[PDB]
Swiss-Prot record:
Annotated 4-O-phospho-L-tyrosine binding sites: 222
Residues annotated for Ca(2+) binding in this entry: 157, 159, 168
Organism: Homo sapiens (Human)
Coiled-coil residue spans: none
Effect recorded for residue 234 to E: No effect on interaction with RET. Binds slightly to SRC, this interaction is independent of SRC phosphorylation. Strongly decreases SRC ubiquitination. Abolishes interaction with EGFR
Subunit structure: Interacts with ubiquitin-conjugating enzyme E2 UBE2D2 and UBE2D3. Isoform 1 interacts with EGFR (tyrosine phosphorylated). Interacts with the SH3 domain proteins LYN and CRK. Interacts (via RING-type zinc finger) with TGFB1I1 (via LIM zinc-binding domain 2); the interaction is direct and enhances the E3 activity. Interacts directly with RET (inactive) and CD2AP; dissociates from RET upon RET activation by GDNF which also increases the interaction with CD2AP suggesting dissociation as CBLC:CD2AP complex. Interacts with SRC; the interaction is enhanced when SRC is phosphorylated at 'Tyr-419'.
Remarks, miscellaneous: This protein has one functional calcium-binding site.
Residues represented out of the complete protein: 11 to 320 of 474
Name this protein carries in UniProt: E3 ubiquitin-protein ligase CBL-C
Keyword set, alphabetical order: Calcium, Metal-binding, Phosphoprotein, Repeat, SH3-binding, Transferase, Ubl conjugation, Ubl conjugation pathway, Zinc, Zinc-finger
UniProt tissue specificity: Ubiquitous.
The record's account of how the chain is modified after translation: Phosphorylated on multiple tyrosine residues by SRC. Isoform 1, but not isoform 2, is phosphorylated on tyrosines by EGFR.
Amino acid sequence: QWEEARALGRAVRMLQRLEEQCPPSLRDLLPRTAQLLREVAHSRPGGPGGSGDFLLIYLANLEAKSRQVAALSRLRRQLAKLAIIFSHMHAELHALFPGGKYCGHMYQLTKAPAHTFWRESCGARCVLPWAEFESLLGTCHPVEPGCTALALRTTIDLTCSGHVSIFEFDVFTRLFQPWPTLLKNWQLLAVNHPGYMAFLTYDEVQERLQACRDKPGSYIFRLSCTRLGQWAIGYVSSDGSILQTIPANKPLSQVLLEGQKDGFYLYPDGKTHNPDLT
Ligand SMILES: [Ca+2]
């Protein structure tokens, strides 16, 4: 209430400080996040998992990750990773508090069945702890206990807070549509497919595909910080030049099958074996 206002205040001063101490770049993200937080502070509880609980979890997590950055190739390997995480935290804040104003209670998921699943399972809540989320999901899509779950957390919990927000669920269900085979799609595209690069930049995809330039049909697919919930495919055309496609709001496996049948997507990461997706 006033606890929230105070924690909002601490957060912004903490970000300004972290900025002094310094794509996706922390120099661009830090002040953007600080500005959004002042707008949030200015515009300002809900039930459990409402705007208040969300802010509390968000601010603790922002704090924890800020300490990790402050206490800092393999140094650059870990700064890059923290930088992606801050990008993710800025996007989540932006989606649930556009212009500082909480919209979590009426936020609309892009895929209709994902929408229905979330609102029927969580009601007005915009955020849920991993354990509850995993359990609720499991009533609809069997999640195997053990290591599968760890890989699934990494895919879904973008902000690495141990909580899944409605935004992260939206991102995940867009990427791995259609709903009826949700986890199966995730398993085929993100666990078992050598074409999958997770988060890359355009430049990194270019760099990666250089060694495949004399092999047209070589391709890869990646996620993008500033375009959460969509794919990009990098591929070698017959000319040997690296092009990028952004697939429509439609299943990735369909785009890849159609591109396999056209001769564009044949060699994931240069490799000869192209997984059967039929
Ligand atoms: Ca999270």
